[PDB]
């Protein structure tokens, strides 16, 4: 499955008023099976492709270090 | 917006769309969707 369900669902699994930053989705990620080591990179993308697809709210930082949200709009 | 939750999570069966403003021009019924 790709990496952007994995990360959508473990955004919605830890829903909540901050959002899940880049090292609780890692922690997701490797809990749900998914090597984050080596495909770290393509999290990063995926990630990043799913900002810009607007799916995820960027709620602080910038980019891929920050904390994320489900965009319910 | 048509929320999907109640006012624990119960769903409603909503959808969360945004509502447009509509306005009447003639014969024509214009919508405007403010996005955000
Ligand atoms: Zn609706």
Redesign the pocket.
């Given at each position: 499955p790709p990496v952007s369900e994995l990360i959508t669902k473990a955004v919605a699994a830890s829903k909540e008023r901050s959002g899940v930053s880049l090292a609780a989705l890692k922690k997701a990620l490797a809990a749900a099976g998914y090597d984050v080591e080596k495909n770290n990179s393509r999290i990063k993308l995926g990630l990043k492709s799913l900002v810009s697809k607007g799916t995820l709210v960027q709620t602080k930082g910038t980019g891929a270090s920050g904390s994320f949200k489900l965009n319910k709009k | 917006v048509?929320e999907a939750d109640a006012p624990k999570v119960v769903s409603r069966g909503?959808?969360?769309?945004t509502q447009p403003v509509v306005r009447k021009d003639g014969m024509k019924l214009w919508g405007t969707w403010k996005k955000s």
């Open positions: - | 048509c909503g959808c969360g769309n």
